[PDB]
PDB file of C-alpha atoms and ligand atoms in Angstrom:
ATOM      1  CA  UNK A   1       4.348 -25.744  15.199  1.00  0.00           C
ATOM      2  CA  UNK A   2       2.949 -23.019  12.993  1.00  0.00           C
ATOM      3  CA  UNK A   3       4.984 -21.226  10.368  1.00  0.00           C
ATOM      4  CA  UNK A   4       6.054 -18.238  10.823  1.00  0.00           C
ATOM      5  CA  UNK A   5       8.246 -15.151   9.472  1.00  0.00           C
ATOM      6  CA  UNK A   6       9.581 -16.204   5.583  1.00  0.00           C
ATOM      7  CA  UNK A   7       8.156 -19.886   5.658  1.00  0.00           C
ATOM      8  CA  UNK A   8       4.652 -17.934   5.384  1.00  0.00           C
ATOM      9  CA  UNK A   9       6.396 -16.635   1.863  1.00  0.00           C
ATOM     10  CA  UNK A  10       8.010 -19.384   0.194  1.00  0.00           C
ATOM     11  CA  UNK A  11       5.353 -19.642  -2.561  1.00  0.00           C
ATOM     12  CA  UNK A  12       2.092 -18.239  -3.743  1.00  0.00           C
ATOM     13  CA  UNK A  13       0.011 -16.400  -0.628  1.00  0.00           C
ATOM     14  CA  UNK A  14      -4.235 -15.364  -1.562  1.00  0.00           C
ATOM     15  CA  UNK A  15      -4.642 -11.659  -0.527  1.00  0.00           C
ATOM     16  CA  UNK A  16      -7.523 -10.452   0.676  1.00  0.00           C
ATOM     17  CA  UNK A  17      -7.964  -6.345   0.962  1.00  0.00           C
ATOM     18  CA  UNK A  18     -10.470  -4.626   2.929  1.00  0.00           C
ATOM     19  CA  UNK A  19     -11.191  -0.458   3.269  1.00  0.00           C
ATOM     20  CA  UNK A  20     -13.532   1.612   4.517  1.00  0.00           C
ATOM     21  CA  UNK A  21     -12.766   5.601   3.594  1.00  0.00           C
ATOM     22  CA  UNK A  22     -14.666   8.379   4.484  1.00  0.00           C
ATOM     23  CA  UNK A  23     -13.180  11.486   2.579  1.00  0.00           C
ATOM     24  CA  UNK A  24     -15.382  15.022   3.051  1.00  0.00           C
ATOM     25  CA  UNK A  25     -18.091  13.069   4.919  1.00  0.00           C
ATOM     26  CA  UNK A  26     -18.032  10.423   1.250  1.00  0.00           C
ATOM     27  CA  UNK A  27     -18.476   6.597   2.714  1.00  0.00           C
ATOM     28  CA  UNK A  28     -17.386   4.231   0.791  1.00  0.00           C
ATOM     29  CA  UNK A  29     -15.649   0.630   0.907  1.00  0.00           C
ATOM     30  CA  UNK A  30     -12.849  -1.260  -1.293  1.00  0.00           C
ATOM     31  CA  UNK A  31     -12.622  -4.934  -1.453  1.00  0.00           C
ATOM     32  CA  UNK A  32      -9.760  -6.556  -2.929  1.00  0.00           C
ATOM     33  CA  UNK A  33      -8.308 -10.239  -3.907  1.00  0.00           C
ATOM     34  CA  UNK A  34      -5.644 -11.884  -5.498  1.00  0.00           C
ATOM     35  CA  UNK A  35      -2.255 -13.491  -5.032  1.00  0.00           C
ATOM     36  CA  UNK A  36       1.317 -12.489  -3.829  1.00  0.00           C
ATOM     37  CA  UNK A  37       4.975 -13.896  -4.480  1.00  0.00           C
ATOM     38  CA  UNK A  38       7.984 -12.683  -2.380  1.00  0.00           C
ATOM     39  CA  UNK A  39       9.860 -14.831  -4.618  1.00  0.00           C
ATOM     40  CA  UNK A  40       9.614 -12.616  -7.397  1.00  0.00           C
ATOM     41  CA  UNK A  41       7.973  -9.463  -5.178  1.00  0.00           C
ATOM     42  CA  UNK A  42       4.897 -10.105  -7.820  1.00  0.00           C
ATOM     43  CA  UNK A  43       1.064  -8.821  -6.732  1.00  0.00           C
ATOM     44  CA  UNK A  44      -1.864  -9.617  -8.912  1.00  0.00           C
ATOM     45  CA  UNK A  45      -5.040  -8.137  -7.479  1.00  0.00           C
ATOM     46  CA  UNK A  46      -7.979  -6.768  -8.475  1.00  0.00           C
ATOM     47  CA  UNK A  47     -10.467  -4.085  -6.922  1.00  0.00           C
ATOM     48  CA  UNK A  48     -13.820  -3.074  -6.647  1.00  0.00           C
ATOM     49  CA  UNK A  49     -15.609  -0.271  -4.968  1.00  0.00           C
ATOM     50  CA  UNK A  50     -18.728  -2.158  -3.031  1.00  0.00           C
ATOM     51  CA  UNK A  51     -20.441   0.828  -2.338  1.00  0.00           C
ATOM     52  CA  UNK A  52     -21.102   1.928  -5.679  1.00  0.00           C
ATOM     53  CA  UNK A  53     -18.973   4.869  -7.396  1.00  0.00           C
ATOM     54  CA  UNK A  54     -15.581   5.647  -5.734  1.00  0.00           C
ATOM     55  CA  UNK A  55     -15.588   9.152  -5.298  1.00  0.00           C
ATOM     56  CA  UNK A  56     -11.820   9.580  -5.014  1.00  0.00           C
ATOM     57  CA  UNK A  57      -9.366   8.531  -7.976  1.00  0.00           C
ATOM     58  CA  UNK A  58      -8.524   5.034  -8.080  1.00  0.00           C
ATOM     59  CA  UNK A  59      -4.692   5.808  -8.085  1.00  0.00           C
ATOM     60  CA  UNK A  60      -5.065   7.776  -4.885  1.00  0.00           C
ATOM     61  CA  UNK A  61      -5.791   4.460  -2.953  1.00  0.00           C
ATOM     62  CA  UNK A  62      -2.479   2.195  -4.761  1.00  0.00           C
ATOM     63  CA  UNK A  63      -0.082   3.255  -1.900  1.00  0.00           C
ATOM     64  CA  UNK A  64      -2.719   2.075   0.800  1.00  0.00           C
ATOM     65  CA  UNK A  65      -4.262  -1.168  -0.988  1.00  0.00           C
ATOM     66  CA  UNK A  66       1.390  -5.279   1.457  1.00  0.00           C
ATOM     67  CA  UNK A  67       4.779  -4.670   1.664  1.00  0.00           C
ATOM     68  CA  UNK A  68       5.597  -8.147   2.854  1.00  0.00           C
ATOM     69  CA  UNK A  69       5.358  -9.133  -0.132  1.00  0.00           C
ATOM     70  CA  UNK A  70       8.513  -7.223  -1.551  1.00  0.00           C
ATOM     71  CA  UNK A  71      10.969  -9.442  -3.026  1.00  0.00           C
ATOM     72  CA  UNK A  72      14.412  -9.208  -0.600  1.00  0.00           C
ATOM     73  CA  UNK A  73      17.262 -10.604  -2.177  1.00  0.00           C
ATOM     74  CA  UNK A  74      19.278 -13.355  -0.824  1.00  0.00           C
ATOM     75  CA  UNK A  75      21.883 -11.205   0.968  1.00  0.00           C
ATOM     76  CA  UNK A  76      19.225  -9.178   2.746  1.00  0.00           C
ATOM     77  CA  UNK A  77      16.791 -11.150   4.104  1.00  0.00           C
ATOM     78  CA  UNK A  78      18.321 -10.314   7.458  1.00  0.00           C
ATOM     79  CA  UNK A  79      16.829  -7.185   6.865  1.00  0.00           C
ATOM     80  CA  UNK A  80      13.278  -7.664   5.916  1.00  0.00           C
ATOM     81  CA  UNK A  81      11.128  -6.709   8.817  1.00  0.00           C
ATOM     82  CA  UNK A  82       7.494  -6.763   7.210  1.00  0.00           C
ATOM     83  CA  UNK A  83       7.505 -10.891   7.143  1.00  0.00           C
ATOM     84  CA  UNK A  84       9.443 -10.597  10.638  1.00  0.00           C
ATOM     85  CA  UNK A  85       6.176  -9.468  12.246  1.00  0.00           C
ATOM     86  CA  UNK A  86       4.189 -12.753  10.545  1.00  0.00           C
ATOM     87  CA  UNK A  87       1.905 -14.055  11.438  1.00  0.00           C
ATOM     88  CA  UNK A  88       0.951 -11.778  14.160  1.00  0.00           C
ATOM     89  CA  UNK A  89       1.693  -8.813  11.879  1.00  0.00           C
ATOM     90  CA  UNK A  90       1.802  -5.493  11.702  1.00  0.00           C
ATOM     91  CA  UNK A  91       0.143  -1.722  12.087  1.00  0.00           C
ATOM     92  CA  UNK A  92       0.730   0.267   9.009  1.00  0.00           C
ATOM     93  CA  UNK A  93      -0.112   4.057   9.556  1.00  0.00           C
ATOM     94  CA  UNK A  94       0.179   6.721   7.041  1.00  0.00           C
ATOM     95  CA  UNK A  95      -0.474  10.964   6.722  1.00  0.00           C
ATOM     96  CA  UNK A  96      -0.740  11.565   2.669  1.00  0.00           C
ATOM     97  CA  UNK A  97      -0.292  15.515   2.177  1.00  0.00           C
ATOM     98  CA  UNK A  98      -2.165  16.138  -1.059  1.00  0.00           C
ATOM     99  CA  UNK A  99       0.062  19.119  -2.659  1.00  0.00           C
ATOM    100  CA  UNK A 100      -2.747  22.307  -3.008  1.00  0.00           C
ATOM    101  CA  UNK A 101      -5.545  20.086  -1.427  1.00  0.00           C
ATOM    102  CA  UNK A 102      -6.706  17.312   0.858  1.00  0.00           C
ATOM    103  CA  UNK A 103      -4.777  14.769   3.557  1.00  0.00           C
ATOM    104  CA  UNK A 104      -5.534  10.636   3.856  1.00  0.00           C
ATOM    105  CA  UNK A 105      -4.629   9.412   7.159  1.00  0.00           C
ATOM    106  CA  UNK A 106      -4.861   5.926   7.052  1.00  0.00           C
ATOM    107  CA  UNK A 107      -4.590   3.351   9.628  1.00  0.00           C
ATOM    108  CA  UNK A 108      -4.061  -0.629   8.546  1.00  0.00           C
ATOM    109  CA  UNK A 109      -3.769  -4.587  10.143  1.00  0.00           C
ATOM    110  CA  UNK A 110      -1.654  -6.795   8.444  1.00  0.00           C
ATOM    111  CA  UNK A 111      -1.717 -10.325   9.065  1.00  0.00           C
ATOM    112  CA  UNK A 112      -2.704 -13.945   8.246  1.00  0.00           C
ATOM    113  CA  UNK A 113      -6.476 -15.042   8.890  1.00  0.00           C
ATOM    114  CA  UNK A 114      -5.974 -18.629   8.139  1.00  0.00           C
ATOM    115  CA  UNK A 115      -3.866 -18.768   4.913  1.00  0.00           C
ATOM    116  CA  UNK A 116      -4.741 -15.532   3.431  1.00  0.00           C
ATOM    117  CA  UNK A 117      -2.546 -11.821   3.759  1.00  0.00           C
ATOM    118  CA  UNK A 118      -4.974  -9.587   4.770  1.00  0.00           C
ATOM    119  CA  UNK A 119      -4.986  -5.815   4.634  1.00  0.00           C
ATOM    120  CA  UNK A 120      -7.466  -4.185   6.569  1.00  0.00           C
ATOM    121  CA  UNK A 121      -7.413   0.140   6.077  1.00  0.00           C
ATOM    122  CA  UNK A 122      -9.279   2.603   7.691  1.00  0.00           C
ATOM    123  CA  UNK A 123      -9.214   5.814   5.988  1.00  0.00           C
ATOM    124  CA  UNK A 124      -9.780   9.406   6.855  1.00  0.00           C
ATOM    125  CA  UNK A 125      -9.597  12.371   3.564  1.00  0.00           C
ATOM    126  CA  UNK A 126      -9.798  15.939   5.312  1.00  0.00           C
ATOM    127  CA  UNK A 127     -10.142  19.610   4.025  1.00  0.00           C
ATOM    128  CA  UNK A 128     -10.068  18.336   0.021  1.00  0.00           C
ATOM    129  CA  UNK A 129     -11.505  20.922  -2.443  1.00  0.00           C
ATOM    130  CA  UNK A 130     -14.769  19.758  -4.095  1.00  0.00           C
ATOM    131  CA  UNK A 131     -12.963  21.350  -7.684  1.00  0.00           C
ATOM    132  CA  UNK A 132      -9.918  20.062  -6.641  1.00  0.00           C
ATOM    133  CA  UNK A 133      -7.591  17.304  -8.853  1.00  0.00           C
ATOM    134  CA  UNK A 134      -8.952  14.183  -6.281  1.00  0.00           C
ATOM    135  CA  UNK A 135     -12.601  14.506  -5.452  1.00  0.00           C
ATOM    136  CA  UNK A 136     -12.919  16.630  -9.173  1.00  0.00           C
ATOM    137  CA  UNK A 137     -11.422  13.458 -10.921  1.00  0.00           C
ATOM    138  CA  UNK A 138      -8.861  14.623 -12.925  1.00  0.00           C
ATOM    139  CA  UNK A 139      -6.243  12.615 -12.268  1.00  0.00           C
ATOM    140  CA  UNK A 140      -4.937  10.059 -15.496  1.00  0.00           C
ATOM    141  CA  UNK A 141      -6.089   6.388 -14.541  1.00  0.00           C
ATOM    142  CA  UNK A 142      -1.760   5.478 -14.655  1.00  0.00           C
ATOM    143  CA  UNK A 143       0.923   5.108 -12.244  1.00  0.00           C
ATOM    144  CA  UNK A 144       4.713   5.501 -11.790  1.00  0.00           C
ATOM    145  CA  UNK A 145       7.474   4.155 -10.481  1.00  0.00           C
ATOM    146  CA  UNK A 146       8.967   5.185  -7.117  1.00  0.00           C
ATOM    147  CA  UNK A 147      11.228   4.042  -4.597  1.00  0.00           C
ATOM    148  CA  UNK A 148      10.185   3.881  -0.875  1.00  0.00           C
ATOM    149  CA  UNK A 149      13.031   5.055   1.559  1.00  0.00           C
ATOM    150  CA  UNK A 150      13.067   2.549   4.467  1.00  0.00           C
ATOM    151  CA  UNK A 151      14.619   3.581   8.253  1.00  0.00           C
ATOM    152  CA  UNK A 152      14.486   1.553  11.365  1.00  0.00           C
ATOM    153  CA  UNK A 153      12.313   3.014  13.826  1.00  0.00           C
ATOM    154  CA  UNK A 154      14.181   1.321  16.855  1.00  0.00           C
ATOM    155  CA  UNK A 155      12.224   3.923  19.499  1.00  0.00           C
ATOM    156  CA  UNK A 156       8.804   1.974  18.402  1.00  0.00           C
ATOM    157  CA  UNK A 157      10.535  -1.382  17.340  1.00  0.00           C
ATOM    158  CA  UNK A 158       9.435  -0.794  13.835  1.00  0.00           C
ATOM    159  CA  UNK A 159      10.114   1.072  10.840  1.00  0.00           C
ATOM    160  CA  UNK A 160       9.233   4.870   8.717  1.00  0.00           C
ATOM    161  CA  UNK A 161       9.234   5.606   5.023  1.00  0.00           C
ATOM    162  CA  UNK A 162       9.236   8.889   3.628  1.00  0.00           C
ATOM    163  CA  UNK A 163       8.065   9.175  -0.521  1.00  0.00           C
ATOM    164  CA  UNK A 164       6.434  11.768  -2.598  1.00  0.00           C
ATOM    165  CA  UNK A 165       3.747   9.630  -5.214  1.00  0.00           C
ATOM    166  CA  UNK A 166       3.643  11.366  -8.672  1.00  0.00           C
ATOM    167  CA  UNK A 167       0.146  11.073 -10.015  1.00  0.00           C
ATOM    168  CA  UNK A 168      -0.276  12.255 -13.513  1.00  0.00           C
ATOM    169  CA  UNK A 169      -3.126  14.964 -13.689  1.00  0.00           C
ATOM    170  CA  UNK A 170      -5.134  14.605 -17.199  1.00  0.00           C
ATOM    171  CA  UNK A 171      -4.518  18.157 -18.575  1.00  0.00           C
ATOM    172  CA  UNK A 172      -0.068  17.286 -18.193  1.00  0.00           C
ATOM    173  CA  UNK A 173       0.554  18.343 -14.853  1.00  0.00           C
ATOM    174  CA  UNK A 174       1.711  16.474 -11.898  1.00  0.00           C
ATOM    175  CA  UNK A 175       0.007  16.080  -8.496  1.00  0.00           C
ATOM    176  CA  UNK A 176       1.987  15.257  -5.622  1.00  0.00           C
ATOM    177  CA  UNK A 177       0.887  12.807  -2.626  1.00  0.00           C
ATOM    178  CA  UNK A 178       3.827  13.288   0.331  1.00  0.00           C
ATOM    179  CA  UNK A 179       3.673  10.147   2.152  1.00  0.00           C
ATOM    180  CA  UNK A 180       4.503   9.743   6.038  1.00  0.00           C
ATOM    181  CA  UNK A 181       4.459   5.954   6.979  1.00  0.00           C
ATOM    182  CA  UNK A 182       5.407   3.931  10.185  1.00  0.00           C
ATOM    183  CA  UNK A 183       4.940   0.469  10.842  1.00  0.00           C
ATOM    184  CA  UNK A 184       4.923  -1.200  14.414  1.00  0.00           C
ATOM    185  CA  UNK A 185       4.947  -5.108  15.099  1.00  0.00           C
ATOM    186  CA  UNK A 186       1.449  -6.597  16.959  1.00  0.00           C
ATOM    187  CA  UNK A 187       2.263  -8.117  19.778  1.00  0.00           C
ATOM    188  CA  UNK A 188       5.713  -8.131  21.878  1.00  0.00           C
ATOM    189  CA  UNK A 189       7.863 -10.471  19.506  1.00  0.00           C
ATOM    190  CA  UNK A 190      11.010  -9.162  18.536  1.00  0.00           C
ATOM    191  CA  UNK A 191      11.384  -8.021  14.806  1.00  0.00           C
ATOM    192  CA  UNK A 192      14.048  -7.525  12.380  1.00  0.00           C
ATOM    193  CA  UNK A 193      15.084  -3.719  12.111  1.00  0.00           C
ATOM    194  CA  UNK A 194      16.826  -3.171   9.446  1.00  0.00           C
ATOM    195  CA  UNK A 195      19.471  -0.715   8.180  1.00  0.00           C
ATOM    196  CA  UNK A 196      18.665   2.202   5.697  1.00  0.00           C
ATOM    197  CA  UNK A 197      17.313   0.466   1.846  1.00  0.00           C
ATOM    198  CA  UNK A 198      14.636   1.233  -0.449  1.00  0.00           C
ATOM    199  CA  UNK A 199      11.694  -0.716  -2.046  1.00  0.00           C
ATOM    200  CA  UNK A 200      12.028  -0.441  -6.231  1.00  0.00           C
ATOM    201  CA  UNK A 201       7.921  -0.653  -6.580  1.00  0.00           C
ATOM    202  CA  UNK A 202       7.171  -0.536 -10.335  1.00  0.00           C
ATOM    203  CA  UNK A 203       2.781  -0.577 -10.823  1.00  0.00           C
ATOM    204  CA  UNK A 204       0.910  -1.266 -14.076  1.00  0.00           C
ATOM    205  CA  UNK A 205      -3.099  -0.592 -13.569  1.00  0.00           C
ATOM    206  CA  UNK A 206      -5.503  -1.908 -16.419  1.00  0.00           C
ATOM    207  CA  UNK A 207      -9.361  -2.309 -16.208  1.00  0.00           C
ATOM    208  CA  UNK A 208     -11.837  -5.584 -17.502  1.00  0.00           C
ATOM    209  CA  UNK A 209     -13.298  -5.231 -20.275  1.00  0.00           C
ATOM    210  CA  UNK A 210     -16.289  -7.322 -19.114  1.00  0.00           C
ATOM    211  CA  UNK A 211     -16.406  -5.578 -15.510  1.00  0.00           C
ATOM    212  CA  UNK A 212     -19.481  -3.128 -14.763  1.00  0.00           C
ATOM    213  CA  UNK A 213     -18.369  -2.272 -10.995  1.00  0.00           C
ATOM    214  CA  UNK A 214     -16.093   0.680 -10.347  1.00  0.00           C
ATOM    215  CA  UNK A 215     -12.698  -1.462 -10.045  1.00  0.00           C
ATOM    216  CA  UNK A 216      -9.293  -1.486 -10.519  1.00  0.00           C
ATOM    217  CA  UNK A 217      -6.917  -4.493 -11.623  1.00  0.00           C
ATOM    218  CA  UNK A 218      -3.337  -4.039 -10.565  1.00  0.00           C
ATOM    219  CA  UNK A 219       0.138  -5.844 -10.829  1.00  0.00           C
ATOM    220  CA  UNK A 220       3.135  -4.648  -8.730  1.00  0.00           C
ATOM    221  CA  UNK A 221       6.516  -5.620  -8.923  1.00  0.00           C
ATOM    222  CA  UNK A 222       8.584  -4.797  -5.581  1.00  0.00           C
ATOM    223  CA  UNK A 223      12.524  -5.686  -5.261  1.00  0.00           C
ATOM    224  CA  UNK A 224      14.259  -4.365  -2.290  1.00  0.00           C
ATOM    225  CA  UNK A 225      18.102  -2.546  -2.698  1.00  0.00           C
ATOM    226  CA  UNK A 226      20.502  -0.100  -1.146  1.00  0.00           C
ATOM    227  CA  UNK A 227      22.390  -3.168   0.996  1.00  0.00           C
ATOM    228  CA  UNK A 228      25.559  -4.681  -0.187  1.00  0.00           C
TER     229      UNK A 228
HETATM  230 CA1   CA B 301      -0.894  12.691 -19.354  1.00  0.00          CA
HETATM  231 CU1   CU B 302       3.506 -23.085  16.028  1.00  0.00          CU
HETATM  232 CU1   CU B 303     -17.803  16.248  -1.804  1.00  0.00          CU
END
């Protein structure tokens, strides 16, 4: 009698976002909470690093800190696999090719405990420089807006994106972060695969005033497009 796929969307859902990275041998944890609406494709959440000092970029994490919560419009909901896979959920994995340095491989559960979307990440950074734009800090605490490319995955019952993440580096260049991403359904319940779109995803990162903790607040807006 539970609810599943969009009735699990219909209004306000509490997030709850857990990481644990280890980039050149570095430990540290994320933990993040706040709210999601597929209505509007609206996050609100807000970060901290609960190990101390993160010793990677804040921005460098955005693309692994929930695409179910991407607003698809009326005439595609057909298409929407991420809240197909709810509750149960899904496995998120990603390679991020630093451009001139480093590589996250990342490897993420998402799924209801109880009420609340969780988003649990492993994370793996290999062969970064130690003078290098990520682990020397020199990337602009910002963010821009890109488009995820979405393609059924029918082989593995799931779906790929393919994106390149612009991060602003402080002195006016640009560091790129080439993003390889599949998702795959837990569980054997069918899915919705759909055809060829893109997620609009549109980020706006600010920091408390009143905060003390290494954090980051963040609000998202995600609208799906490219069906007619
Ligand atoms: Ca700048
Ligand atoms: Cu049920
Ligand atoms: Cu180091």
């Amino acid at each position: 009698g539970h609810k599943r796929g969009e009735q699990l969307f219909t209004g306000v859902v509490p997030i709850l976002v857990e990481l644990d990275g280890d980039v050149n041998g570095h430990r540290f944890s994320v933990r993040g909470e706040g709210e999601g609406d597929a209505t509007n494709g609206r996050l609100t959440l807000r970060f901290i690093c609960t190990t101390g000092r993160l010793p990677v970029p804040w921005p460098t994490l955005v693309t692994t800190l929930v695409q179910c919560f991407s607003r698809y419009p009326d005439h595609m909901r057909r298409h929407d696999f991420f809240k197909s896979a709810m509750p149960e959920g899904y496995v998120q994995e990603r390679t991020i090719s630093f451009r001139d340095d480093g590589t996250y491989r990342t490897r993420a559960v998402v799924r209801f405990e109880g009420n609340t979307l969780v988003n649990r990440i492993e994370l793996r950074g290999t062969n970064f420089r130690e003078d290098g734009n990520i682990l020397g800090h020199r990337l602009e605490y910002n963010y821009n807006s890109h488009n995820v490319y979405i393609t059924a995955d029918r082989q593995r019952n799931g779906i790929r994106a393919n994106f390149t993440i612009r991060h602003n580096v402080e002195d006016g260049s640009v560091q790129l972060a080439n993003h390889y991403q599949q998702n795959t359904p837990i569980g054997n319940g069918p899915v919705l695969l759909p055809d060829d779109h893109y997620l609009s995803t549109q980020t706006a990162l600010s920091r408390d005033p009143n905060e003390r903790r290494d954090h980051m607040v963040l609000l998202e807006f995600v609208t799906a497009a490219g069906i007619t």
